[PDB]
């Protein structure tokens, strides 16, 4: 699949073929400086946002932390939080998602940041969405 180039935020776009074991998704962009305190990347089914297999949500709040969760039919599950905040307001990032058989691995600027165990089948994910305090240069699939 060809990359999404300069997609406007909020963005949602199809992942051709769906998530597959071994697929790497790169999100390259820049956190905005003075335009809110959260952004999110969502791996989801369709365009509604009610079924999100993996919600990755950095929050520049309470010292900085990231939330990971899953939404099923509108309902959020148990939150996983890491206090490590590897993003900075105004700064560019390379955010890499790797789909593996039991989990996602998430790399930020070349360093493993978190994993997230699958709670729903990843093959049902056909769409990526990005929202909040970020601008995007590209989303690639490889
Ligand atoms: C308005 Se209810 C949802 C919020 O629940 C909050 O828990 C509230 C518990 Si009491 C009502 C006992 C004080 C969570 O801290 C918050 O992170 C959580 O926020 C959601 O978190 C979700 C992830 O779990 C999404 O990020 C969603 O966007 C965000 O609104």
Distances in Å between the Cα of 34 and the Cα atoms of 37, 61, 124, 130, 138 are: 8, 13, 35, 18, 21
Owning domain of residue 80: 1-142
CA atoms 70, 73, 78, 79: torsion sign = positive
The answer to whether 31 and 87 are in contact (CB under 8 A) is yes
DSSP string, 33-51: SSS-SBEEEEEESSSSSS-
CATH number of the structural domain spanning residue 69: 2.60.120.200
Q: How many domains does the chain have?
A: 1
**DSSP secondary structure letter of residue 124:** G
CA atoms within 13 A on the CB side of 141: 17
Torsion, Cα 54 56 111 113, to 10 degrees, reads: -90
| Most informative mutation of 54, 71, 79, 131 for ligand 1 (most atoms within 8 A of CB) | 79
119 a known binding residue? no
């Amino acid at each position: 699949q060809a990359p999404y180039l300069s997609p406007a935020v909020p963005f949602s776009g199809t992942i051709q073929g769906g998530l597959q074991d071994g697929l790497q998704i790169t999100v390259n962009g820049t956190v905005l400086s003075s335009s809110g305190t959260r952004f999110a990347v969502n791996f989801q089914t369709g365009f509604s946002g009610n079924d999100i297999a993996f919600h990755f949500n950095p929050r520049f709040e309470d010292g900085g932390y990231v939330v990971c969760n899953t939404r099923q039919n509108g309902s959020w599950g148990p939150e996983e939080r890491k206090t490590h905040m590897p993003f900075q307001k105004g700064m560019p990032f390379d955010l890499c998602f790797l789909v593996q058989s039991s989990d996602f691995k998430v790399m930020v600027n070349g360093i493993l940041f978190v994993q997230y165990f699958h709670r729903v089948p990843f093959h049902r994910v056909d769409t990526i969405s990005v929202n909040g305090s970020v601008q995007l240069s590209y989303i690639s699939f490889q």
